[PDB]
Amino acid sequence: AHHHHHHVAVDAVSFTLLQDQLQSVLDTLSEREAGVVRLRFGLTDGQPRTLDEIGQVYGVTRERIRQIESKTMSKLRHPSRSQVLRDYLDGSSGSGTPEERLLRAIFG
Amino acid sequence: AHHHHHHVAVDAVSFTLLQDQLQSVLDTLSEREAGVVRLRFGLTDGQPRTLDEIGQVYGVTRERIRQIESKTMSKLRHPSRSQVLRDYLDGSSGSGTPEERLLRAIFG
Amino acid sequence: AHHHHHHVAVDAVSFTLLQDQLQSVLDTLSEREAGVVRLRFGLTDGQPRTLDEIGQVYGVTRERIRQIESKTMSKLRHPSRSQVLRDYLDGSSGSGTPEERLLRAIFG
Amino acid sequence: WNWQLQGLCRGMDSSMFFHPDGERGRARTQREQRAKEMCRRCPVIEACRSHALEVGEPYGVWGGLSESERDLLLK
Amino acid sequence: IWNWQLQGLCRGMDSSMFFHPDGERGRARTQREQRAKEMCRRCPVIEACRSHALEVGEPYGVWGGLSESERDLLLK
Amino acid sequence: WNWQLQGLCRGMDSSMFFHPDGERGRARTQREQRAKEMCRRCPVIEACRSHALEVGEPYGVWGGLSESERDLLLK
Ligand code: SF4
Ligand code: SF4
Ligand code: SF4
Ligand code: NI
Ligand code: NI
Ligand code: NI
Ligand code: NI
Ligand code: NI
Ligand code: NI
Ligand code: NI
C-alpha cells in the first residue's frame, strides 16, 4: 500500500529506496523529463530503452534525447531539488511511517 | 502475501517490522485498545488522529482516550505480554520464514 | 511487481532474499526436485510438508523423498550451479534493479 | 528490556496485572494481591521495580508494587 | 549531497529559476540567468557549488553563480 | 564458498557432475570419467575435494572423486 522498496548498495554504502518517494522525485520533473527517465532506466516495464527507442516515443532525434537525459540528471543533482533526493536516499530511516510513530510512543 | 514490512531507525538502532507480526501485537489487545492504537498512529488509513477525533469515534471524552492510550502503552511494555512485542521488534531475523528453513537445509 | 523479499539472519550474517531470484534457483532444478523443495520448505502455501505427505504426492517412499532432497541440496551447493545461489544470497546489493541504474546515472 | 526474559508473569494473562476500567473495592484489592504474590516469587522483581520507578509506568502492578504505591515512592 | 548542498540558498526553489526552458534564447535567457546569479551571489556555498559544477562539468543550469556557457569557456 | 568462484565447471552443465536416477554400470562410469577429466584441469580441485570430504557431500563428483571414492576415504 506503501511498502514497495528496494535495497541497493553502491560501493560500501547501502540504501533503502521507497517507490512512493521515487514517485515524489519524478513528480518534480516535467512530463517529458520524467517520461525519458522512466523509459531510459526501465522504471515501469523493467526494460531500459535505447536513445533511438525514446526518440521514437517523443518524435525527436537520439541526440535530443541525450540532451534531455543530460539536463534531467543536472536538475536532479542541483541543490534546488536536493531535499527531495536526500529524503529518497534516506529511506532506511522509516521517517514518516506509522511504525515510527508507534515505536516513539512505546519507547518514550 | 506476508512480505509487507518497514525499515525504521530509532536512534542508532535499526528495526525491520513485519505487518503480520504488528497484527499479532494488536490481536493481544482488546478491540477498543487496538482500535485506539490504530487511529492514534494512523495504522490503517495513514492519518494519525487527534484525541478529540478518537473520542468522537468511541463516544468518550478526550481525557478517556488519553487514559486508554496510556494504559495500553503500559500493557505493551509489561513483561506479561511483551514477548509478542519482542518478536515484532526482531523482524530482521526472518525467524519462521520458508526462506529460513531453506537456508538451514542448504547450510547444514 | 518484483519487490517481494525477506530479511533473514543466519548466525551473525544477514541476507536479503528476493522472491524472483528464489524462483530462478528453483527453475534450475527438475520438476520433481523443485516440487519436493517447495513442499518440504512450505515455499508456496507456507505449510512445510512431512516426508510421508511428499511421498504420497510423488508416489514414492519416504526414503526416496529423503534421497531426492539430499541430492538436490548437493546440487545447489555444487560449484557448477552454485552461481544462481550466490546471486540469491547477495540480494541486498540490488544488482539489476531499475533503482541501481538510476543511482549510477545520478551519482556518475 | 532484557530482564523481562526471566519475568515469572511472561506466560500468565496480563489481566492479572492490570485492573479493568471501573474496578473498585475488594475486587481491586484481590486482583492486586494475586499479582503481588507472583512478583514476590519472580527472579527479576528488583529490575521490574526499577524500570517502573525510573519511567513512572502509569498503570499496572510492576515489581510487586501497585501504581499508587509507586506514586508514593516517587512523590 | 550530504555536505554543502544542505546550505544552498536555492533549496526548494523552482528549478526553472536555474534552468532554461528548451529553446530559450536572447533577452529571456539573459534575464533568467541574471536572476539566478543574483541568488548565488547571496549564497553561503557558492564556492563549493561552483567547484562541484566545474569539477564534474555539469552540462546544464546555473551553478555557483556561473552560467553553462561561462563554465564551458572556463573548461575549454 | 570462495574457492567456488574459480571452479572450472562453473559455466558447464551440472548434469556432467551428477548421475540421473537409475544410471548404472558403463553409462555411470563414462559420465564420472568425463567429470573427473574436468576436475583434473581445475585450479580448485583440492579445495573442492576438501569441502566434499569435510561435509561428506552425499551426491555428485567433487574434487575429482566420486561419491563412492569419498565414502571409502571417510570410512
Ligand atoms: S516482578 Fe511481577 S510484573 Fe515484574 S516481571 Fe516479575 S512477575 Fe512480572
Ligand atoms: S551557488 Fe547558486 S545554485 Fe549553488 S547552492 Fe547557492 S544558490 Fe544554489
Ligand atoms: S574440482 Fe571438479 S567439481 Fe570441483 S570446482 Fe573443480 S571442476 Fe568443479
Ligand atoms: Ni505498500
Ligand atoms: Ni505498512
Ligand atoms: Ni507478503
Ligand atoms: Ni515470501
Ligand atoms: Ni514487486
Ligand atoms: Ni520497484
Ligand atoms: Ni526490506
Author numbering:
A (entry chain F), B (entry chain B), C (entry chain D): 439 to 546
D (entry chain A), F (entry chain C): 15 to 89
E (entry chain E): 14 to 89
Give the exact sentences the study uses for this entry.
Mycobacterium tuberculosis (Mtb) WhiB3 is an iron–sulfur cluster-containing transcription factor belonging to a subclass of the WhiB-Like (Wbl) family that is widely distributed in the phylum Actinobacteria. WhiB3 plays a crucial role in the survival and pathogenesis of Mtb. It binds to the conserved region 4 of the principal sigma factor (σA4) in the RNA polymerase holoenzyme to regulate gene expression like other known Wbl proteins in Mtb.
We also generated a truncated WhiB3, denoted WhiB3TR, without the C-terminal residues (aa 91–102) containing the putative DNA binding motif to improve the protein stability and crystallizability. Two crystal forms were observed from the same crystallization drop, with the larger crystals in the P43212 form and the small ones in the R3 form. However, in the crystals, the His6-tags in the N-terminal σA4-βtip of three WhiB3:σA4-βtip complexes are “glued” together by multiple nickel ions from the crystallization solution, resulting in a trimer of the WhiB3:σA4-βtip complexes in both crystal forms. Three WhiB3:σA4-βtip complexes in the trimer form are found in the asymmetric unit of the P43212 structure. The crystal structures of the WhiB3:σA4-βtip complex in the P43212 and R3 forms are essentially identical except for the N-terminal loop region, with an average Cα root-mean-square deviation of 0.27 Å for WhiB3 and 0.42 Å for σA4, respectively. First, the N-terminal residues (aa 446–456) of σA4 in the WhiB3:σA4-βtip trimer form a β-hairpin with the His6-tag residues, instead of being part of helix hs1 of σA4 as expected. Second, βtip in the WhiB3:σA4-βtip complex, which was expected to form intramolecular contacts with σA4 in the σA4-βtip chimera, sticks into a neighboring protomer of the trimer and forms intermolecular interactions with σA4 in a second WhiB3:σA4-βtip complex. The resulting σA4-βtipʹ, however, resembles σA4-βtip observed in the WhiB7:σA4-βtip complex and the RNAP holoenzyme, and thus it is used for the following structural analysis.
